[PDB]
Amino acid sequence: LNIADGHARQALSPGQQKIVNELPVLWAESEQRPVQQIESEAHQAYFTLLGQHGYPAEPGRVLSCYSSSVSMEILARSLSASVDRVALVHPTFDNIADLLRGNGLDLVPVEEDALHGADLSAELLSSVGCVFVTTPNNPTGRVLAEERLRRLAEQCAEHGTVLALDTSFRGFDAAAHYDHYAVLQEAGCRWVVIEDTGKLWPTLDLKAGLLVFSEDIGLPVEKIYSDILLGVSPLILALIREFSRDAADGGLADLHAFILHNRSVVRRALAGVEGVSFPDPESRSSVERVAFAGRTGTEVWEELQRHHVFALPCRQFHWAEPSDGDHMVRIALSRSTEPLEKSVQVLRTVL
């Protein structure tokens, strides 16, 4: 009973199963057509699905990568050409910190209340070459509102700072479906966005990271991209195109209802336990934090494993101060509902 990894493992819907049954036809098409044409259609379907109508649609502006973490490796190594220190939201997906640190960047944490609630200070912005925001955030689900994105992009433009966004969880939360590219382009800051198809649908990790950047980004992202790959399989792009079209034709609303159902299953099973609470009441993401008293998430993780249930302690997401995550675990919701419910009834007994 795995409730750890964020990638989707629930059953395909009937519409998605139809796409899988057409793989031999998508192969035929991918053999026959120029990859750039399938790529453009995949990008258009995915960006427009999620409200990002102002994305730059000229060939070459959106660089398709094998994954979002490959995009992040490209960006991190590019940043290291001209940047020493990066401001990074805390907590967040820890691979981002690992890839930045591994490419030689010093990291400055920005807590979520500072990031959403107020302008970044001049002292902070004057000490970093890049501000990095995951939105919706993993693990918290917190969405950077349009008014704050606009102010943050304006601040980065004044300070000469790169604004970088990781939007892997975008598909799960309609509040993240306002047009981010329209905001970024009107502010005129140096900007980069890493989109990701990989967390949305159960595609057996067939996915792309989509690296998008301003024309004045002033980092060697295109050169380093080209040292790592020429592009992704046209079959994967064709799959992204078809899953996005199924999503636009009702699949995405069904996904949101599914995640909401599983989130409610978790909260229903655990809410009666004294001292158990849900740190992110309004999250719509596919992962769910649970807080408890009297024990650590590491101890809960150890006990769950004895019962063959695999969840995640939260320490690792607090990449700057791990003890901040000591009294929480994270539960993956992109799972079939029956195994998920059995897992949380085990967690209920533990807590």
Distance CA 15, CA 35 (A): 24
Q: For a copy of itself, which is the closer residue by CB, 70 or 266?
A: 70
Binding residues for Cl ion, rule: CB under 5 A, are: 6
In the complex, minimum distance from the CB of residue 95 to a copy of itself, in angstroms, rounded to a whole number:
6
CB 343 within 8 A of CB 3: yes
Task: Give the residue, chosen from 129, 139, 234, 251, that forms a contact with a copy of itself under the rule CB under 8 A.
Answer: 234
**Nearest alpha carbon to residue 288 among 3, 9, 90, 7:** 3
Stretch that binds a copy of itself, among 65-73, 180-188, 268-276, 286-294 (CB under 8 A): 65-73
Distance CA 209, CA 165 (A): 13
User: Taking CB under 5 A as the rule, does residue 316 contact Mg ion?
Assistant: yes
Q: For a copy of itself, which is the closer residue by CB, 98 or 154?
A: 98
In the complex, minimum distance from the CB of residue 73 to a copy of itself, in angstroms, rounded to a whole number:
6
**Nearest alpha carbon to residue 170 among 39, 263, 46:** 46
Close Cβ partners of 28 (under 8 Å, ≥ 6 residues apart): none
Helix/strand/coil percent split, the chain, to 5: 50, 15, 35
For residue 72, the tally of other CB atoms under 10 A from its CB is 26
In the complex, minimum distance from the CB of residue 199 to Cl ion, in angstroms, rounded to a whole number:
7
In the complex, minimum distance from the CB of residue 255 to a copy of itself, in angstroms, rounded to a whole number:
18
Strand ranges inside the chain, DSSP E: 62-65, 85-90, 106-111, 130-134, 162-166, 190-196, 209-213, 287-291, 312-313, 328-332
Partner that binds at residue 6, options Mg ion, a copy of itself, Cl ion, none, CB closer than 5 to 8 Å by kind: Cl ion
In the complex, minimum distance from the CB of residue 87 to a copy of itself, in angstroms, rounded to a whole number:
20
Task: Give the residue, chosen from 73, 195, 242, 280, that forms a contact with a copy of itself under the rule CB under 8 A.
Answer: 73
User: Taking CB under 8 A as the rule, does residue 77 contact a copy of itself?
Assistant: yes
The full length of the chain comes to: 351
Site size for a copy of itself (CB under 8 A): 34
In the complex, minimum distance from the CB of residue 29 to a copy of itself, in angstroms, rounded to a whole number:
10
CB 206 within 8 A of CB 236: yes
Stretch that binds Mg ion, among 3-11, 60-68, 311-319, 331-339 (CB under 5 A): 311-319
Encoded amino acid at 342, one letter:
K
Stretch that binds Mg ion, among 40-48, 257-265, 285-293, 313-321 (CB under 5 A): 313-321
> Exposure of 21 by Cβ count < 10 A (0-12 exposed, 13-18 middle, 19+ buried)?
exposed
Q: For Cl ion, which is the closer residue by CB, 196 or 242?
A: 196
In the complex, minimum distance from the CB of residue 333 to Cl ion, in angstroms, rounded to a whole number:
11
Question: What is the per-residue DSSP string for 113-170?
Answer: HHHHHSPPPHHHHTT-SEEEEESS-TTT-----HHHHHHHHHHHHHHTPEEEEE-TTG
Helix (H) or strand (E) holding 71: helix 68-79
Tokens read off for 307: 């019962």
Residue bearing tokens 């302008």: 119
In the complex, minimum distance from the CB of residue 129 to a copy of itself, in angstroms, rounded to a whole number:
18
Q: For Cl ion, which is the closer residue by CB, 79 or 311?
A: 311
In the complex, minimum distance from the CB of residue 330 to Cl ion, in angstroms, rounded to a whole number:
8
Partner that binds at residue 179, options a copy of itself, Mg ion, Cl ion, none, CB closer than 5 to 8 Å by kind: none
Close Cβ partners of 253 (under 8 Å, ≥ 6 residues apart): none
User: Taking CB under 8 A as the rule, does residue 224 contact a copy of itself?
Assistant: yes
Task: Give the residue, chosen from 22, 29, 94, 222, that forms a contact with Mg ion under the rule CB under 5 A.
Answer: 94
User: Taking CB under 5 A as the rule, does residue 324 contact Mg ion?
Assistant: no
Q: Which residues bind Mg ion (CB under 5 A)?
A: 94, 316
Q: Which residues bind a copy of itself (CB under 8 A)?
A: 5, 20-21, 23-24, 27, 30-31, 66-67, 69-70, 73, 77, 95, 98-99, 102-103, 202, 204-206, 224, 227-236
